Ligand SMILES: NC(=O)c1ccc(N)nc1
């Protein structure tokens with residue numbers, strides 16, 4: 001469709017990506033051609049009898065690396081399919097830390113190619129010669145780049161028009177039926193039908209929750225007059 | 240086995256979890272009974288004809304929330320299956336930010352229950368009454384908690400003995416065959432077979448890469464004498 005997104009994926013385990021292409025909001029996006037996810041498996045680019053996709057690191061060490069030739073050939077094939085303009089991304093803990101601002105940046109691309117490493121990762125020279133950007137989804141280590149790739153895909157998919165049916169703050173609390181749950185009642189303001197009061201309450205809650213849980217996030221913001229007031233109110237009430 | 244881990248999962252899309260239970264290192268862990276992942280679907284705890292799992296938020300707004308009764312009943316069932324000692328975790332951007340230290344903390348639990356929200360999330364009172372800890376995998380918004388749950392599972396699985404076949408720094412570069420790749424050569428030290436020189440080179444590279452890419456990570460460390468020296472060397476060479 002309009003701001004259709006195409007994402008090429010290089011992975012030894014392409015079936016993992018069914019988790020986003022077959023279910024939920026992202027599954028719908030794929031079915032409706034708002035999002036296309038296309039996978040290439042380095043194992044298909046091997047030539048030896050046992051289809052070897054790993055190789056030993058120079059200098060020794062416990063682990064293995066992705067074998068260069070099958071991975072390189074898979075990447076080249078994905079690039080040829082993408083045509084001009086596709087940004088190639090490698091997922092790793094050494095990459096730029098993903099946050100919502102970074103998601104909105106990545107979402108500007110009509111085409112992405114995501115390279116998923118396994119084992120101890122990929123040859124440094126491939127990063128230099130084939131990768132445009134290195135990204136991390138957070139400061140922790142996983143068994144492979146597939147979950148980070150899927151996480152990135154899901155996050156950017158939300159910005160594709162038609163996929164869905166924030167302002168630097170944590171979300172406010174939400175309530176649904178029943179009116180009373182284990183003695184806990186819904187805040188009366190949410191029952192009032194006073195849409196302006198409800199708005200300000202939610203905003204105040206978001207400011208309070210951000211202040212108590214993630215105060216560093218507030219330092220990155222230029223609060224509006226209204227937000228400054230409601231935050232001061234919340235801090236006074238907290239005291 | 241020994242430090243076997245059991246993880247209960249509450250999700251509207253349990254088939255997504257095949258991505259970790261059927262493939263790779265985590266698939267092996269599950270097959271070998273080092274890791275058990277057990278899923279309950281709130282849709283199975285509905286009683287109406289159309290198996291409704293969402294509900295309208297008090298106070299209005301665009302989105303929907305998880306319906307309380309099916310979700311609550313699924314959680315209670317998972318808790319009964321887990322028996323005593325299981326920590327219940329809700330995945331959301333309002334939670335404690337996951338990092339490797341937090342992974343090692345979570346890995347100390349023999350039993351976890353992971354609640355995956357969809358839509359605009361779950362009722363605040365359920366968080367108060369059913370959830371022990373809220374965790375986030377990073378400062379970005381996804382369509383549901385399943386990818387964060389899987390990310391958490393993968394990260395903690397790596398600490399289960401037998402699953403695998405770091406010190407605050409980014410990883411060093413890695414090289415494998417061929418010796419020359421698009422004119423780019425493997426660092427001679429890695430070919431030298433001098434294991435002490437190789438160690439120090441890798442450590443120096445990790446310190447240099449951490450300094451250039453993530454200097455804030457260094458401020459959280461008490462560097463060893465050796466690390467202080469190699470970092471000073473790298474910074475001098477960089478200049
Ligand atoms: N933090 C990450 O984005 C990441 C990427 C790959 C991997 N094996 N582990 C972690």
Ligand SMILES: NC(=O)c1ccc(N)nc1
Pocket residue numbers: 330331332356374375376377378379380381382383384387
């Ligand atoms: N950052 C997170 O851990 C997260 C959890 C749930 C969701 N829908 N989006 C993001």
